[PDB]
Design an enzyme around this catalytic site. Structure first.
Site, PDB file in Angstrom:
ATOM      1  N   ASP A   1      45.533 160.602  57.664  1.00  0.00           N
ATOM      2  CA  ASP A   1      44.201 160.435  58.230  1.00  0.00           C
ATOM      3  C   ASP A   1      44.293 159.812  59.616  1.00  0.00           C
ATOM      4  OD1 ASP A   1      41.413 160.937  57.188  1.00  0.00           O
ATOM      5  OD2 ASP A   1      41.150 158.864  57.850  1.00  0.00           O
TER       6      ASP A   1
ATOM      7  N   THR B   1      38.651 163.201  62.028  1.00  0.00           N
ATOM      8  CA  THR B   1      38.988 162.005  62.789  1.00  0.00           C
ATOM      9  C   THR B   1      40.129 162.236  63.769  1.00  0.00           C
ATOM     10  OG1 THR B   1      40.363 161.300  60.934  1.00  0.00           O
ATOM     11  CG2 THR B   1      38.123 160.450  61.041  1.00  0.00           C
ATOM     12  N   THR B   2      41.001 163.208  63.509  1.00  0.00           N
ATOM     13  CA  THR B   2      42.018 163.585  64.480  1.00  0.00           C
ATOM     14  C   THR B   2      41.448 164.478  65.574  1.00  0.00           C
ATOM     15  OG1 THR B   2      43.577 163.549  62.631  1.00  0.00           O
ATOM     16  CG2 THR B   2      44.353 164.451  64.712  1.00  0.00           C
TER      17      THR B   2
ATOM     18  N   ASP C   1      38.143 162.106  51.703  1.00  0.00           N
ATOM     19  CA  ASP C   1      37.776 163.103  52.704  1.00  0.00           C
ATOM     20  C   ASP C   1      37.086 164.295  52.054  1.00  0.00           C
ATOM     21  OD1 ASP C   1      38.686 161.592  54.779  1.00  0.00           O
ATOM     22  OD2 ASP C   1      40.291 162.957  55.390  1.00  0.00           O
TER      23      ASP C   1
HETATM   24  N1  LIG Z   1      44.306 176.773  55.795  1.00  0.00           N
HETATM   25  C1  LIG Z   1      44.116 176.515  57.110  1.00  0.00           C
HETATM   26  N2  LIG Z   1      44.494 177.399  58.056  1.00  0.00           N
HETATM   27  C2  LIG Z   1      44.311 177.153  59.363  1.00  0.00           C
HETATM   28  N3  LIG Z   1      43.747 176.031  59.838  1.00  0.00           N
HETATM   29  C3  LIG Z   1      43.318 175.061  59.000  1.00  0.00           C
HETATM   30  C4  LIG Z   1      43.486 175.254  57.555  1.00  0.00           C
HETATM   31  N4  LIG Z   1      42.987 174.157  56.961  1.00  0.00           N
HETATM   32  C5  LIG Z   1      42.540 173.331  57.940  1.00  0.00           C
HETATM   33  N5  LIG Z   1      42.742 173.868  59.155  1.00  0.00           N
HETATM   34  C6  LIG Z   1      42.374 173.250  60.451  1.00  0.00           C
HETATM   35  O1  LIG Z   1      43.064 172.018  60.653  1.00  0.00           O
HETATM   36  C7  LIG Z   1      42.232 171.136  61.405  1.00  0.00           C
HETATM   37  C8  LIG Z   1      42.504 169.685  61.029  1.00  0.00           C
HETATM   38  O2  LIG Z   1      42.087 169.440  59.691  1.00  0.00           O
HETATM   39  P1  LIG Z   1      42.696 168.207  58.860  1.00  0.00           P
HETATM   40  O3  LIG Z   1      44.032 167.858  59.460  1.00  0.00           O
HETATM   41  O4  LIG Z   1      42.611 168.570  57.399  1.00  0.00           O
HETATM   42  O5  LIG Z   1      41.687 166.974  59.085  1.00  0.00           O
HETATM   43  P2  LIG Z   1      41.282 166.414  60.536  1.00  0.00           P
HETATM   44  O6  LIG Z   1      40.270 167.409  61.045  1.00  0.00           O
HETATM   45  O7  LIG Z   1      40.710 165.054  60.222  1.00  0.00           O
HETATM   46  O8  LIG Z   1      42.576 166.398  61.304  1.00  0.00           O
HETATM   47  C9  LIG Z   1      40.800 171.559  61.130  1.00  0.00           C
HETATM   48  O9  LIG Z   1      40.083 171.667  62.361  1.00  0.00           O
HETATM   49  C10 LIG Z   1      40.893 172.926  60.485  1.00  0.00           C
HETATM   50  O10 LIG Z   1      40.198 173.882  61.284  1.00  0.00           O
HETATM   51 MG   LIG Z   2      40.621 167.230  57.421  1.00  0.00          MG
END
Ligand SMILES: Nc1ncnc2c1ncn2[C@@H]1O[C@H](COP(=O)(O)OP(=O)(O)O)[C@@H](O)[C@H]1O
Ligand SMILES: [Mg+2]
Ligand SMILES: Nc1ncnc2c1ncn2[C@@H]1O[C@H](COP(=O)(O)OP(=O)(O)O)[C@@H](O)[C@H]1O
Ligand SMILES: Nc1ncnc2c1ncn2[C@@H]1O[C@H](COP(=O)(O)OP(=O)(O)O)[C@@H](O)[C@H]1O
Ligand SMILES: [Mg+2]
Ligand SMILES: [Mg+2]
Lengths: 525, 205, 533, 536, 76
Positions: free
Chosen positions: A61, A94-95, A391
């Site tokens: 996170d 949050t990232t 989350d």
């Molecule tokens: N299966 C997936 N394939 C491609 N992109 C993804 C997938 N799951 C999540 N993402 C992308 O990764 C980004 C970061 O999500 P995540 O790391 O879960 O939380 P955060 O947004 O807090 O970093 C999101 O903007 C999302 O669009």
């Molecule tokens: Mg996320």
């Protein structure tokens, strides 16, 4: 600096002014963004932070990682604050907020260095953010059919997408279904404290369970507790706030007697008070007795002799959860223990879970709560599992509030960047450069996904840009297939408010940091 | 490289004379460090208000005693400090003053001590130098006013850096009232003397 | 022949750490230089194009803002002359609420020109006399420069347009939205009675959604939770108690004396029955919300839950008084049931959740009451603090408008007109005071000069254009911010107006501070010693 | 530390690249404020009270203390540019730093450094070719006005910029004075043969251009005359003192009667040598070695000027100009010891002139070759040193313009034209080399941006207008006259710099581009740093 | 690889570790030292020991019992 015999401010006061301090602020924001850069997407990693006392935390996170970094730079703390804001309002992204704010600042840094007035940059940021938010609201896909099963698939897909970046991503379907059920259990306010989360050491993730009721650890059993039966098939639960043990009647109470008969009468009166409370509780019909205040050994043995169950010092949250699950009322007095103030559950049982004893209240048909029991091999394993589940829970709550989604994986921001570039092509030109910089900065997230996954970011970005130019709103990065794909048809779904809040917070942070021209550090007291 | 079970055996009993000779000096030092940390690090490394009675208190303090003003006793060595702190009845309060000549605010509090000792015979006001005690440089540079209190061998007051709460030109009544705020100070003129076996008197018998 | 001994007399008797500055170039010029330095530090935050400053105090607290008074407060100044100028600025803030930067800039310019006059050959007395005469002339001239008046304070659009300018210098990008918010909040307050209380406006800072989500609530918001299990009321009947929700006790010493077994067996039952009767008597008056200032007993909470009574516990007495004002209840000192007149009525009380914060909302459906709350959303604590400061500036502007409805053109128009008129007056008067009068007039140029410098254009061209236009006859013309080249435009038509009373007080305070600085001749500094606070 | 087991630090990956870019950007930002006519000089305090006021980038980077190796690389680049060209030091430092920064920006996007290096090489080659083919101006079409304008352009940004109308004339006259032809018919101009003397006093307008040579020396004896109306100069590389026998020769006396004769001979040898020198009519005697008091007396009696301890380079220049022959010894091919009148330099006049309480020798109107010298007057020594540095820059610029008859318009016109052309050209080379060349073209725009920033003017609008003008020039065949559109810092508007007489030698731009490209290539090739701890 | 002989250190300050040969050597030396100390007091002709305490009281103990000898010694 000519030394005045008496100086204006205190000695040791520091002051940085002009373009150099703004460039320093931008560089500090870049440094902060780099500290959470690699925790993005399904291929994101985790960071381990050791505090001064030796305790270590492992987290994916962004908000948690930024909180554990003791950032003291005044301009860098803004990124931490906006990460906290995104965590509070939405819970996910949050990232993304930090990456977007840092990318905005990085893109406008060359214009700052050449003497551009920061007010122009601020106005351009405000205009671009307003346009992007309006575009997100316009193109967000919503299903206005009020179908229950369609809402189930929507929530499950959103939870799966929110969960596909953590250590539990390999079991995303299981936890997504559990989270959707848990959130649907809550009635109308969706309190977080109505979703208990218990962590018991030892056990695989697949052994984690969701109980339709309430469960809590055994609380300092007294003597004679092992004689109490540990399973009931239709118990009535007496939720109590009462200290059931021999003690002084009141703190400021004194007894004055001058006869041995009166002495014996006083002793028997204390015993009779305790036994009267116990007899009232027993004749209320309840079989399981839970109290917030301690339950003494005498009461424990009294309940054991009646084949009852007792548990003292139960935490406040656990009693509230039990009240919502079973349907009773926390009684501070036992004088009126009617039928309507007693909790009722189908099955109560105490079972061994990973070297611990847990009391299970299951079978509640009208429960407004639930409890997560998480298994794992380490404490930080469980902490990060709880963070990921939080989350997902926040995302599902938001999706309950508003069922509007956009395809993730950078597709939404690629479309936004295309739209913003198209808009910027139709303005005089001073704002055109800045809005184009905003559109280019919007491409950081897909590029970061490709870089984390180890792709060639430039080729994927070119493919995405051409594809969006020739049509296709929801085409984003496909991590597994090394290429691009329709993320909406790939069920990579996130609520629109997540990206809306991300853009708003990043723009606000960038505008606030850009507007500062001078920083002054008074000496520490 | 063997023989971890050394078992020195006969060695000690033939050398415990020199070992105890060193240990005596070591213990003489050790009591000194033990006694010299009780104020260090813990706080060292870090219209009724007009009080019209204080004026008349000052004037009556000006006429305190006839014989002499007397001077606050000066400690010459750490051993002397040790053996006057350890000695004397534990029922009386002893307060020690630390100073270095040159810093402001020393003569004023010395005069306050002189006045209080003149008007409090039970008290045993004494002063020490900061250099003779060998305290840390931080004490010598930023903790010049130090009024240690010894009531029965333990502190009941550890007033350090009293300049802020007392000023730089305080008088005897100010220090007396400040010390009496926390209850530190316990509550006729003969010709010269009266004191002169145990046989008293008898009659006829 | 290698040392210069201290001169006999005062030099030898001076204390070790003390400092003595006497004469013109040793005291007056140094004070003027210090005030110049302070004004220079604060200058770059003047006007709509003012830039925020990140100021960190001695407690590591971060203040980012462009409010001059706030910057001066968080800047721990050491020079006595700058300290006096800061006191003048704080007095201006206390009296009016806006114009602190004007006070600082005017005082700095006045002291600069006073030093220039002292150097060319004038004396302190004649400079002070000329400054006072010019200040009297300016205070006489200023009422003639009043362009328009408020002429209506109950209209949302009019008050919003009036307050836009005051919260346009701060938060320049988005001022219309904040203007409308503050206008609604102030119009809800300010009843038929002419008195307006600034304290009646409450600001709640809730993090998470950006300031575009900010809203005004006709009531009070408390960042707390409810003691009981009741979390929503639709026709609230609040009964406010200044006493803890528990059975009252004696004050000397309460000892329970038991002499027989029956008393011991019946004491707890009797106390429980008594408290149940008390709570039932409270509930029988129709009340369904109980607000207490003290603690809540467990049995009290039990019996309140049994009778479906909402519980709110306010720790601070100011919040209790504000709630009593906004609901209309009376803070009862005992636990007796409230009579009909002392009963407080709010149209809706419920437990909500904004962002991640639990709040208790006392909401009125009517557009009136005694207290109105502005709920501020944002993504940063410092940003919400700045929005709050802009809110206080707007509220103080509303208060000034209630006290005095006259307005003068902003954007440097009033200062240029004052400078021109005072310069014209100074020509007529003979004697040495004409130089001081002309310098006082010229000191007014520092306002349009600062505005032009902050806006990014050349100040000399702006000042020349302003003089040309004002010589033509147009006295409502100031610099145009939305321009990449030095340009001027009418300020009355554009609505860029500021309060007459604020300008009058700022001029008076700045002149007094400058004169007081000039009067001092000798300085005897004591040893700084200690005294952290 | 880990399994590598080396006694020192180690930085790998983006960390070391960012560190190198930070060091280069620091070096750039040191001198970014001293570029262009609106630039400002700098004050360098030597930590012991010595003060140097300068605008020259090479001097600034030389006097500073530098610890990071990349910063040392840029400082050495500045020194190399100063040695090989003499102008454009600040420009080359800024361009190299900007090139490195943009290359690292490309690298951080997962573009391999080899691709960026190849693109940079292609862009540099194309830029040099385009400059040599389109942007050069032949100086034969302008004559002396081109030299005057180039000198004046070099004057700007220096303490003598406003007085350029007069200083450029002095520079051009001095450079033309020392012109001489050699083999293969190439007229080469030997700069550093123009002796520059600093002496505070009157204003800069009182600076004197001497039609001859100016020594920083005085006559040996006060009895010697201080003015010769027809100078016969004899240049000597030996010293005139009482002869001392060498180490291998020892005097052993057994008959006392020989001691007086030996002692007399010991000085009569030098007496005879001086008599031989003077018998040919020599009027002025210059020697690198010392002169004894008796020899000074001989010269005084003969009524001739004798100067001792003359610097070797000054003596060589005087002998070359006046036609004299440097004589390290008096020894002909017949084994004798004679001095010939045929090896006497001749000058119209030698004067012991007085300049601000100090005195110096002026050799006016030397024959058989013309030589020039400059005496600079200023408020104090610091200003005089700055005048000397700026004068040397102007002399180098004029020498470059005269040797190679091509000049290019100044004021950032070349940079904007190159940026436009390379941005258009990058579309036809490679796939990532396209990005590398585009970043090279964008990096070249750092010069006009810095010029506009130094004047507190709108850099964005001015650079946009310049780019529009140059794009129109490159796209419209009939508007090829817009290539000369540069920057006018006085008014902040685009201006025809060729008409305005703002010129630079083409060699300056070409060498700056080549050196900056090579420095950026050298720094960019690094991706790992091992910093071993000192042996202590 | 071993915990002690690894490029990365896994222990706190003062924590040590002995592998096979070193641990066996330590155990054998300790056991042999104890056995050699307690012996020579065995059988009819065994002699006694003087246990001189190093404490403040400085207890003196002359004994032949092996258990008392072994319990009244500082063993590491
Ligand atoms: N299966 C997936 N394939 C491609 N992109 C993804 C997938 N799951 C999540 N993402 C992308 O990764 C980004 C970061 O999500 P995540 O790391 O879960 O939380 P955060 O947004 O807090 O970093 C999101 O903007 C999302 O669009
Ligand atoms: Mg996320
Ligand atoms: N849109 C505008 N154009 C030109 N001048 C303006 C504009 N808005 C405000 N001003 C000027 O800015 C001044 C307010 O400065 P401000 O930063 O508020 O100082 P203070 O907070 O001390 O009042 C007013 O005198 C007004 O004339
Ligand atoms: N009169 C002028 N007008 C416009 N530009 C000029 C003028 N004179 C010089 N310049 C430009 O200013 C730039 C900076 O030159 P400068 O920094 O003084 O030389 P260097 O780089 O050798 O120190 C040069 O590239 C030149 O093109
Ligand atoms: Mg204001
Ligand atoms: Mg140059």
């Amino acid at each position: 600096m000519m030394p005045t015999p008496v100086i204006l401010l205190k000695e040791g006061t520091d002051s940085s002014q002009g373009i150099p301090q703004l460039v320093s602020n931008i560089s500090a924001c870049q440094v902060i963004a780099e500290a959470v850069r690699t925790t993005l997407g399904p291929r994101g990693m985790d960071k381990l932070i050791v505090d001064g006392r030796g305790k270590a935390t492992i987290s994916n996170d962004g908000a948690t990682i930024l909180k554990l970094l003791d950032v003291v730079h005044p301009a860098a703390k803004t990124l931490v604050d906006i990460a906290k804001s995104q965590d509070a309002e939405v819970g996910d992204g949050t990232t993304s907020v930090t990456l977007l704010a840092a990318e905005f600042l990085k893109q406008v840094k060359p214009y700052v260095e050449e003497g551009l007035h920061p007010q122009i940059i601020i106005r351009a940021f405000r205009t671009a953010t307003q346009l992007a938010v309006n575009k997100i609201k316009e193109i967000a896909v919503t299903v206005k059919k009020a179908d229950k099963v369609e809402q189930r698939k929507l929530l499950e897909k959103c939870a799966m997408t929110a969960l596909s970046s953590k250590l539990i991503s390999q079991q995303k379907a299981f936890f997504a279904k559990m989270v959707v059920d848990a959130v649907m259990m809550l009635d109308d306010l969706l309190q977080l404290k109505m979703i208990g989360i218990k962590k018991v050491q030892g056990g695989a993730l697949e052994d984690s369970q969701l109980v339709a009721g309430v469960a809590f650890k055994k609380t300092f059993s007294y003597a004679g507790f092992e004689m109490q039966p540990k399973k009931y098939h239709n118990p009535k639960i007496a939720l109590l706030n009462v200290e059931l043990e021999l003690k002084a009647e009141k703190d400021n109470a004194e007894i004055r007697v001058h006869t041995v008969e009166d002495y014996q009468a006083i002793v028997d009166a204390e015993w009779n008070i305790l036994y009267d409370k116990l007899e009232k509780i027993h004749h209320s019909g309840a079989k399981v007795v839970l109290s917030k205040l301690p339950i003494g050994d005498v009461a424990t043995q009294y309940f054991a002799d009646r084949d009852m169950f007792c548990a003292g010092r139960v935490p406040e949250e656990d009693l509230k959860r039990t009240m919502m699950a079973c349907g009773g009322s926390i009684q501070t007095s036992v004088n009126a223990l009617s039928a309507d103030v007693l909790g009722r559950c189908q099955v109560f049982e105490e079972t061994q879970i990973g070297g611990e004893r847990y009391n299970f209240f299951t079978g509640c048909p009208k429960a407004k709560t639930c409890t997560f029991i998480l298994r794992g091999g380490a404490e930080q394993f469980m902490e990060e599992t709880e963070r990921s589940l939080h989350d997902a829970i926040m995302i599902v709550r938001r999706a309950i509030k508003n069922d509007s989604v956009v395809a993730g994986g950078g597709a939404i921001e690629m479309e936004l960047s295309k739209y913003l570039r198209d808009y910027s092509r139709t303005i005089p030109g001073k704002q055109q450069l800045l809005i184009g910089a905003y559109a280019k900065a919007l491409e950081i997230i897909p590029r970061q996904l490709c870089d984390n996954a180890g792709f060639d970011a430039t080729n994927i970005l070119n493919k995405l840009r051409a594809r969006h130019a020739q049509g296709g709103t929801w085409y984003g990065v496909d991590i597994n297939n090394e290429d691009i794909a329709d993320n909406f048809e790939a069920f990579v779904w996130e609520p629109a408010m997540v990206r809306i809040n991300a853009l708003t917070a990043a723009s606000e942070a960038a505008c606030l940091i850009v507007s500062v021209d001078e920083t002054i550090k008074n000496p520490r007291s | 490289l063997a023989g971890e079970g050394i078992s020195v055996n006969t060695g000690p009993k033939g050398v415990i004379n020199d070992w105890r000779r060193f240990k005596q000096l070591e213990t003489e030092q050790r009591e000194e460090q033990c006694r010299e940390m009780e104020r260090l690090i813990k706080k060292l490394s870090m219209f009724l208000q007009q009080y019209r009675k204080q004026r008349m208190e000052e004037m009556r303090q000006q006429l305190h005693k006839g014989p002499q003003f007397k001077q606050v006793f000066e400690i010459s060595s750490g051993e002397g400090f040790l053996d006057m702190i350890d000695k004397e009845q534990k029922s009386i309060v002893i307060m020690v003053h630390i100073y270095e000549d040159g810093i402001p605010g020393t003569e004023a509090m010395n005069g306050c001590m002189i006045c209080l000792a003149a008007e409090y015979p039970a008290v045993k006001f004494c002063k020490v130098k900061s250099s003779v005690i060998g305290a840390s440089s931080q004490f010598t540079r930023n903790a010049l006013p130090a009024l240690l209190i010894y009531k029965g061998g333990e502190l009941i007051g550890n007033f350090v850096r009293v300049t802020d709460q007392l000023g730089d030109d305080f008088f005897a009544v100010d220090l007396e009232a400040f010390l009496q705020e926390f209850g530190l100070l316990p509550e006729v003129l003969t010709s010269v003397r009266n004191s002169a076996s145990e046989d008293s008197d008898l009659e006829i018998d | 022949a290698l040392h210069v001994p201290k001169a006999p007399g005062f030099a030898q008797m001076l204390k070790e750490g003390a400092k003595h500055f006497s004469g013109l170039e040793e005291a007056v010029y140094r004070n003027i230089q210090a005030c110049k330095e302070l004004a220079q530090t604060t200058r770059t935050a003047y006007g709509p194009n003012g830039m925020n400053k990140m100021v960190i105090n001695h407690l590591e607290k971060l203040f980012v803002t462009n409010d001059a008074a706030t910057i001066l407060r968080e800047l721990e100044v050491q020079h006595p002359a700058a300290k006096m100028i800061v006191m003048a600025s704080h007095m201006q803030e206390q009296e009016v609420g806006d114009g602190t930067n004007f006070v600082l800039v005017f005082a700095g310019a006045l002291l600069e020109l006073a030093e220039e006059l002292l150097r060319i050959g004038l004396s302190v007395s004649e400079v002070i006399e000329g400054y006072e005469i010019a200040c009297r002339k300016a205070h006489e001239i200023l009422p003639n420069l009043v362009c328009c008046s408020a002429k209506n304070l109950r209209d949302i659009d009019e008050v919003s347009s009036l307050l836009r300018t005051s919260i346009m210098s701060k938060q320049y990008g988005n001022e219309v939205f904040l203007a409308k918010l503050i206008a609604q909040a102030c119009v809800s307050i300010f009843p038929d009675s002419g008195h307006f209380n600034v304290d009646n406006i409450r600001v709640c800072k809730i993090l998470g959604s950006g300031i575009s989500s900010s809203s005004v609530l006709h009531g009070m918001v408390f960042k707390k939770e409810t003691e009981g299990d009741v979390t929503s009321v639709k026709d609230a009947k609040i009964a406010v108690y200044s006493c803890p929700f528990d059975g009252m006790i004696t004050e000397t010493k309460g000892t329970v004396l038991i002499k027989t077994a029956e008393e011991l067996m019946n004491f707890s039952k009797g106390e429980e029955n008594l408290m149940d009767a008390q709570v039932k008597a409270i509930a029988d008056t129709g009340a369904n919300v109980v607000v207490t200032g003290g603690k809540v007993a467990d049995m009290a909470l039990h019996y309140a839950n049994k009778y479906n009574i909402m519980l709110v516990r306010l720790n601070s007495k100011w919040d209790l008084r504000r709630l009593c004002k906004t609901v209309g209840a009376t803070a009862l000192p005992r636990l007796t049931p409230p009579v009909l007149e002392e009963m407080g009525h709010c149209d809706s009380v419920y437990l909500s959740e904004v962002g991640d914060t639990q709040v208790v909302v006392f909401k009125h459906e009517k557009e009136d009451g005694a207290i109105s709350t502005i709920v501020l959303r944002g993504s940063t604590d410092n940003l919400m603090d700045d929005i709050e400061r802009a809110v206080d500036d707007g509220v103080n502007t509303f208060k000034v408008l209630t006290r005095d409805k006259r307005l003068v053109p902003g954007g440097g128009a009033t200062e240029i007109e004052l400078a021109k008129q005072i310069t014209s007056y100074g020509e007529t008067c003979p004697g040495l005071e004409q130089y001081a009068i002309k310098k006082f007039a010229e000191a007014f140029e520092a306002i349009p000069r600062a505005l032009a410098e902050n806006s990014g254009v050349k100040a000399n061209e702006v000042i020349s254009k302003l003089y040309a236009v004002h010589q033509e006859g147009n006295k409502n013309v100031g610099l145009d911010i939305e321009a990449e080249v030095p340009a001027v435009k009418d300020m009355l038509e554009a609505g860029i107006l500021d309060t007459y009373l604020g300008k009058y007080w700022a001029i008076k305070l700045a002149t007094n501070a400058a004169v007081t600085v000039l009067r001092v001749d000798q300085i005897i500094m004591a040893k700084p010693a200690g005294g952290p606070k | 530390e880990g399994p590598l087991s080396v006694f020192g630090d180690r930085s790998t990956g983006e960390t070391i690249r960012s560190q190198n870019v930070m060091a280069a950007a620091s070096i750039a930002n040191i001198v970014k404020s001293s570029l262009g006519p609106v630039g400002l000089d700098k004050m360098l305090v030597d930590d012991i009270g010595d003060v140097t006021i300068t605008n020259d980038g090479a001097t600034i980077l030389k006097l500073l203390e530098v610890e990071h190796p990349a910063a040392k690389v840029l400082c050495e680049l500045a020194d190399l540019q100063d040695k090989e060209v003499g102008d454009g030091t600040t420009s080359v430092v800024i361009i190299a730093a900007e090139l490195l920064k943009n290359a690292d920006e490309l690298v951080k996007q997962k573009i391999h450094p080899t691709s960026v290096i190849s693109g940079y090489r292609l862009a540099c080659k194309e830029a040099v070719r385009y400059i040599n083919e389109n942007l050069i101006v032949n100086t034969d079409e302008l004559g002396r006005d081109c030299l005057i304008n180039a000198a004046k352009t070099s004057m700007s940004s220096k303490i003598i910029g406003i007085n350029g109308d007069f200083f450029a004339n002095m520079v051009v006259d001095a450079v033309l004075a020392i012109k001489y032809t050699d083999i293969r018919g190439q007229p080469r101009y030997p700069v550093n043969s123009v002796n520059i003397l600093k002496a505070h006093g009157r204003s800069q307008m009182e600076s004197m251009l001497i039609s001859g040579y100016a020594l920083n020396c005085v006559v040996g004896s006060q009895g010697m005359p201080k003015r010769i109306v027809n100078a016969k100069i004899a240049c000597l590389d030996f010293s005139l003192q009482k002869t001392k026998m060498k180490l291998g020769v020892q005097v052993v006396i057994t008959d006392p009667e020989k001691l007086d004769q030996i002692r007399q001979r010991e000085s009569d040898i030098t007496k005879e040598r001086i008599q031989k020198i003077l018998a040919t009519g020599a009027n002025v005697i210059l020697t690198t070695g010392g002169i004894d008091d008796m020899c000074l007396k001989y010269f005084v009696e003969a009524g001739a000027m004798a100067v001792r301890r003359v610097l070797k380079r000054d003596l060589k220049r005087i002998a070359k100009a006046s036609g004299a022959t440097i004589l390290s010894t008096l020894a002909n091919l017949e084994g004798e010891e004679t001095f010939e009148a045929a090896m006497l330099g001749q000058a119209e006049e030698v004067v012991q002139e007085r300049i601000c309480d100090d005195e110096l020798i002026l050799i006016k109107n030397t024959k058989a070759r013309t030589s020039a010298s400059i005496i600079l007057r200023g408020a104090n020594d610091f200003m005089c040193d700055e005048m000397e540095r700026s004068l040397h820059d102007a002399l180098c610029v004029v020498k470059r313009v005269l040797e190679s008859k091509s000049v290019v318009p100044g004021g950032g016109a070349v940079e904007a034209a190159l940026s436009i052309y390379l941005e258009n050209y990058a579309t036809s080379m490679g796939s990532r080399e396209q990005l590398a060349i585009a970043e090279f073209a964008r990096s070249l725009l750092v010069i006009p941006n810095t010029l506009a920033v130094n004047a507190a003017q709108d850099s964005t609008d001015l650079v946009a207008k310049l780019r529009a003008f140059h794009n129109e020039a490159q796209v419209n065949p009939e508007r090829k006259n817009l290539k000369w559109i540069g920057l006018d810092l006085s008014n902040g508007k685009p201006r025809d710099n060729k008409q305005a007489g703002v010129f630079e030698p083409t060699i300056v731009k070409v060498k700056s581009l080549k050196f900056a490209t090579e420095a950026a290539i050298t720094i960019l090739r690094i991706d790992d740093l091992i910093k071993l701890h000192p042996e202590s | 690889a071993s915990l002690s002989l690894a490029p990365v250190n896994i222990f706190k300050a003062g924590a040590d570790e002995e592998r096979a040969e070193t641990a066996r050597l330590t155990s054998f030396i300790g056991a042999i030292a104890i056995g050699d100390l307690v012996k020579s007091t065995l059988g009819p002709k065994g002699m006694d020991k003087i246990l001189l305490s190093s404490g403040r009281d400085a207890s003196l103990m002359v004994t032949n019992d092996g258990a008392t000898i072994l319990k009244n010694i500082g063993v590491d």
